[PDB]
Amino acid sequence: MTQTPDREKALELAVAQIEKSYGKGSVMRLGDEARQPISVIPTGSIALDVALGIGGLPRGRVIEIYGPESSGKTTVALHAVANAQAAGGVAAFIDAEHALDPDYAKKLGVDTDSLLVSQPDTGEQALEIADMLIRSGALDIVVIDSVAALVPRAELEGEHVGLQARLMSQALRKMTGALNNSGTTAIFINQLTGGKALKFYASVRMDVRRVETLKDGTNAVGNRTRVKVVKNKCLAPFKQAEFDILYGKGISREGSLIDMGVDQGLIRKSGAWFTYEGEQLGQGKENARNFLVENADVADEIEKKIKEKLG
Numbered sequence: 001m002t003q004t005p006d007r008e009k010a011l012e013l014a015v016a017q018i019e020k021s022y023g024k025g026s027v028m029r030l031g032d033e034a035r036q037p038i039s040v041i042p043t044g045s046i047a048l049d050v051a052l053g054i055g056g057l058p059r060g061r062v063i064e065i066y067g068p069e070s071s072g073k074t075t076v077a078l079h080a081v082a083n084a085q086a087a088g089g090v091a092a093f094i095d096a097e098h099a100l101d102p103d104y105a106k107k108l109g110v111d112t113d114s115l116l117v118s119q120p121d122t123g124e125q126a127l128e129i130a131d132m133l134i135r136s137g138a139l140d141i142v143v144i145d146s147v148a149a150l151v152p153r154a155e156l157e158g159e160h161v162g163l164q165a166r167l168m169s170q171a172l173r174k175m176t177g178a179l180n181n182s183g184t185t186a187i188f189i190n191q192l193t194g195g196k197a198l199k200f201y202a203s204v205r206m207d208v209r210r211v212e213t214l215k216d217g218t219n220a221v222g223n224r225t226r227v228k229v230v231k232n233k234c235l236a237p238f239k240q241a242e243f244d245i246l247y248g249k250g251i252s253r254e255g256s257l258i259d260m261g262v263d264q265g266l267i268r269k270s271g272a273w274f275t276y277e278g279e280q281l282g283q284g285k286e287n288a289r290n291f292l293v294e295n296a297d298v299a300d301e302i303e304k305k306i307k308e309k310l311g
Contacts, residue, residue: 025203025233032236036311041141041185044079044108045243045256046303048227050310052204053235056083059140060183061203061234062176066190071210072225075108075245077143077187082109084185089140092116094130096123096149108250123150123164127171130186134178143187147194168197176201205231214244221286222246254292257302258285266305276302 018026024035040056043049049056057063057080065073081091086109093100095117102112116133120126127150130142144150152163179186188198192207199205207228214222228240243259244252258274258281261267267276267288274281274288276298281288292299 023233025235028236030236030238035235039183041080042083043076044083044251044253045241046253046260046306047241047243047256048076050260051227051229051239051241053232053239055307055311056080057185057187058203058234059185060180062172062179062186062188062198062201063204063206064188064190064198064202064231065206065208066192067208068192068210071223072208072227072245072251073189074145075250076206076208076225076227077189078105078108078110079251080185080187081105081115081141081143084141085109085111085114087140090114090116090138092118092130092133092139092142094126094142094144095119096126096144097146100145104248104250107248122153122156124153124167124171126150127167127175131171131175131178134175134182134184134186137182137184139182139184141185141187143189145189147188147190147198150194164194165196168194172197172201199231202231203233204229211242214246216286220247222249222252225251252289254289254299255285257292257299257306258288260306261302264306264309266302266309 015027035054037054039059040054041059042056043052065077067073084091093115096119098119106112118129120129126144130144133139134142147168150164150167152167155163175186190198207230209226211224211226213220214224222244224242225245226240226242229237231237244255246252258267261276262269267274267281273283282291
């Protein structure tokens with residue numbers, strides 16, 4: 001075929017036809033900039049917010065955060081809970097592992113007092129409680145802790161396998177419509193279990209892993225986490241982000257502005273020195289981090305400028 005411009009026109013229509021019938025993110029190009037809603041729940045680190053593309057987590061979708069035991073996951077999730085909360089929204093936490101540290105959560109900014117928490121007897125139950133809690137159109141973010149811990153009635157009774165992968169499927173189908181119709185975003189912490197089902201219904205899927213144990217000079221102030229969004233029907237996939245999660249403090253927002261500040265020219269590193277638009281922030285990443293945290297006025301100035309240079 002001798003073609004050239006007529007090809008790009010047939011392809012444009014093609015994609016058009018696919019998008020129409022299977023949805024917006026049905027086909028995309030890794031270089032696309034497209035889409036940007038009015039609704040998004042910040043993750044807590046600008047780094048990850050841009051990797052997600054839409055500036056945070058998509059509302060009305062089912063998100064899946066998975067990873068090894070002790071990388072971030074819950075932290076990242078608790079953050080998405082604190083931010084949904086900071087906009088006067090209400091959060092729920094269906095708990096099946098019995099491992100939540102309210103003190104840590106309150107430190108991340110979770111209004112633990114108004115945190116609807118429930119600890120189900122079986123897995124099916126856990127989904128239903130989250131299902132009707134979802135349908136009241138009152139909840140903004142609902143997090144289900146551990147898909148692996150959602151044991152089914154049968155197994156919990158004695159009465160073989162193929163339980164979870166069924167229990168989840170039946171749920172996700174039904175729960176997917178309710179979600180897309182309520183503007184609520186559900187986060188599933190997973191082990192990397194419920195497998196397939198969640199892997200496909202989910203609009204976003206994040207692989208969180210602990211890169212390095214942040215050397216504080218002394219012992220360790222935090223950990224350098226790395227998320228890799230393997231699935232994103234909201235924007236070009238396969239993007240990644242690294243951020244610090246300080247022991248007891250959570251994700252360093254300030255540490256993200258610096259990292260993103262330099263990689264965008266907004267902050268200049270003149271050899272051990274960090275400078276921003278004339279004046280020096282400090283000597284060392286942690287110094288500047290501490291500078292930015294004590295001086296919020298300038299901290300969100302950087303966040304602002306970088307959000308203007310992207311979105």
